[PDB]
Amino acid sequence: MANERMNLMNMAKLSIKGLIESALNLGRTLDSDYAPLQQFFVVMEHCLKHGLKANKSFWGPLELVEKLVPEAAEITASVKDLPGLKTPVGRGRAWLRLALMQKKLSEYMKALINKKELLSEFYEVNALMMEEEGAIIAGLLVGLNVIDANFCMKGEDL
């Protein structure tokens, strides 16, 4: 099960590389409908799913971040107090996108890998988040702190 952590990482380098470059070559705030950006989350999602156990999906591991990095308490409670967001995976995809904005996504991730004694509750013995690739990516996520994207959560004019 190492041929998967290898694909995911080299499937993250591109997703991350391409985004950081395009984003900088564009020079303007990114919107949700930005292919290179959405493609990142698709991958970022898969990476966090790989190795999960027993349905909070990857939303469960993310709920730990607040206890580790208090600076994350806010966005963690902003996805909960947000109607229209049913599924847990939804609270997860919503969480990531907010971190991308806070430019703290990289910090939260690192805060987890260095606490495997906690992930072991949601991930198998050797999930991407429990191995080397989990760090290589946590470090590449530092280049996304220069990403100024703005995602829409909801709106109502009636």
What is the residue whose two structure tokens read 């988040």? 129
CA angle 15, 33, 79 (to 5 degrees): 85
Please identify which residue in the block is written with the tokens 């609270």: 91
How far is it, in rounded angstroms, from Cα 8 to Cα 13? 9
| Residues 6 or more apart whose Cβ sits within 8 Å of residue 110 | 135, 138, 139
**Residue pair 113/5 in contact by the 8 Å Cβ criterion:** no
Q: Answer for the pair 147, 100: CB distance below 8 angstroms, yes or no.
A: yes
Question: Which experimental approach was used here?
Answer: X-ray
Cα distances from 145 to residues 52, 78, 104, in angstroms, run: 27, 20, 7
Rounded to whole angstroms, what are the CA distances from 93 to 26, 76, 117?
Answer: 24, 12, 24
Gap between the Cα atoms of 32 and 26, Å rounded:
15
Give the C-alpha separation, 23 to 31, whole Å. Answer: 11
Identity at 127, one-letter amino acid code: A
> Is residue 55 helix, strand or coil?
coil
Q: How far is CA 10 from the centre of its chain?
A: 16
Angle of CA points 69, 71, 72, to nearest 5°: 75
Q: Give the count of beta carbons closer than 10 Å to the beta carbon of residue 144.
A: 20
Supply the CATH number for residue 118's domain: 1.20.58.900
Structural domain count, the chain: 1
Domain extent at residue 43? 2-158
Both tokens of 45, joined, read 């999602």
